[PDB]
Amino acid sequence: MNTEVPARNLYAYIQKLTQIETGENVTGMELEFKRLASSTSRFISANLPCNKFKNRLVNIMPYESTRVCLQPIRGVEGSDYINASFLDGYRQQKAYIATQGPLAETTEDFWRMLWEHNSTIVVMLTKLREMGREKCHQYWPAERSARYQYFVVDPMAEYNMPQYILREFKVTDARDGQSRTVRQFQFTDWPEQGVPKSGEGFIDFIGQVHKTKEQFGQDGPISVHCSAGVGRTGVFITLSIVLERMRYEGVVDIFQTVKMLRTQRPAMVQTEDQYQFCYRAALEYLGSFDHYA
Amino acid sequence: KLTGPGDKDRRNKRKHELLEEACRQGLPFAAWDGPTVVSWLELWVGMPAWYVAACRANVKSGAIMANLSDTEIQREIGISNPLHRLKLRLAIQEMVSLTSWEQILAYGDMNHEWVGNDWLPSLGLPQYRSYFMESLVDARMLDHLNKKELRGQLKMVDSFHRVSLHYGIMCLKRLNYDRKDLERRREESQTQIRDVMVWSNERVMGWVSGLGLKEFATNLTESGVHGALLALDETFDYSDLALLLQIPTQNAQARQLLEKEFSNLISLGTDR
């Protein structure tokens, strides 16, 4: 079934998905989202008893073929493991790392991950705590310098923007004194239930993050995390790819994009609501161009 | 590809016309209002959105902007990075001078993206691209970079790589920072031994290949070897080059050939 739609047909296509017709109980949207299910590598490192506490959810683990590996540490089994996956982007290979919100116990691993893989832009898609539950451990220092194993992380500055906060850090490898600047963009406008009422804030945020990568010439992957690193993180990466492809090629294929992401990390874009929001936001972005409104 | 106007282009065009009106109308920088300096900081200086937002909240005039101390720039604009502060200082000073358009409102012809994507790779120094761009180093800043910033923030520990930058900058100066002239002169020296001072690292590799030393040319990738170095550094000789080309001492014919061709290159294409 063709799910690739030219821009000018996107309004009509979405309307047809919202509708239910020809003798089925469910909407076209729900049918399409369920069709993603039928669509793979293995979970090896993630299932080692030495690594079980490193996973936020037992049923969300990286595929072996795309997992982000750490350099092993002498005598510590499992030290090469973090729950994180590479995903390709529109223009570059390994454009993203999708990962869970760090645990207290994987916080040192998280910083080593950013270091070993030259990730200097991090995207946080949750608050620390939501609905009475920890979503993410606070892995960054508040006011003074902090040491996470080999790395000294020094808070440089904090900027409050309308729908996000940017935190800048200097991270130093205490072993040899090398240092990099790391930037964290935390989106602060995702509701604790459901999806944003409008996609405009999230679209602008996507734009700002990628503008930053371009302007500062940062070639490494953007590390993106939410709770488990598949739901909101799936939305961020889906829309990052789909919005740029729509702008340069004038077509949208959200179904095949999510399918593609799920070949690189399981369960990307986890709920129908999130899936529907991808369409909704793409249509909103399309409307910022007069000849397609 | 999506065609036509839109929300973003309207917003940008309106920001630009604040800038173009102050400039063309001969309004000195000190007399610029808030929205104008904010537009200027975004479009002409090229600062990230968070500095721009800080400026909008805390800096209501060009006069204010012009008289900020270093510690006040850090506080009112939020600029921690010493090289980002350098960028602003030089930008302000340039703007004050020009407002007291011929000044190119096609800003960014030699901004930090040109330095990063175009110029540093042409010097055989593409491995420094990310550090220069993260410090927003534009052409205007290059001659002002002090030894501490080069060593630390810009990660240029290698003394040869720093010498390579130096002669790259000397070339820019001699060309009066005329990007078009640099490009023209590289195009008109592609196929002859002429104007070696302007040659890219790629062109130098092309020259080595043309000698019959093609299997060694690739070794000059990230070496910092470029024409302005060959033309302006009197200490750089054929044996220095042979080493960077990684020609084995056993390949004596290749080394003799390089010696003779290098002599020819300097004699015919430089003033050494």
Numbering used by the authors:
A (entry chain A): 1212 to 1250, 1254 to 1507
B (entry chain B): 807 to 906, 943 to 1114
Authors' own words:
Type IIa receptor protein tyrosine phosphatases (IIa RPTPs) function as presynaptic organizers. The vertebrate IIa RPTP family consists of three members, PTPδ, PTPσ, and LAR, which share the same domain architecture with a large N-terminal extracellular domain, a single transmembrane segment, and a cytoplasmic domain. The membrane-proximal phosphatase domain (D1) is catalytically active, whereas the membrane-distal one (D2) is inactive. Liprin-α is an active zone protein and the first protein identified as an intracellular binding partner of IIa RPTPs21.
Here, we present the crystal structure of the complex between PTPδ D2 and the tSAM domain of Liprin-α3. The final model was refined at 1.91 Å resolution with Rfree of 0.208. The D2 domain of PTPδ adopts an α/β structure, which closely resembles the reported D1 and D2 structures of IIa RPTPs (Cα rmsds of 0.59–1.23 Å over 244–287 residues). The pseudoactive site of PTPδ D2 retains the catalytic cysteine residue (Cys1440). However, the tyrosine residue in the phosphorylated Tyr recognition loop and the aspartate residue in the WPD motif, which are critical for the phosphatase activity, are replaced with Leu and Glu, respectively. The interface between Liprin-α3 and PTPδ D2 is located on the opposite side of the pseudoactive site. The D2 domain of PTPδ interacts with αN, SAM1, and SAM2 of Liprin-α3 but not with SAM3 in the present crystal structure of the PTPδ D2–Liprin-α3 tSAM complex. At the interface with SAM1, Tyr1373, Leu1380, Phe1399, and Phe1430 of PTPδ form a hydrophobic pocket, which accommodates Trp856 of Liprin-α3. At the interface with SAM2, Phe1430 of PTPδ hydrophobically interacts with Leu978 of Liprin-α3, whereas Arg1397 and Asp1433 of PTPδ form hydrogen bonds with Glu976 and Arg971 of Liprin-α3, respectively. Taken together, the SAM1 and SAM2 interfaces are critical for the binding between PTPδ D2 and Liprin-α3 tSAM, whereas the αN interface contributes little to the binding.
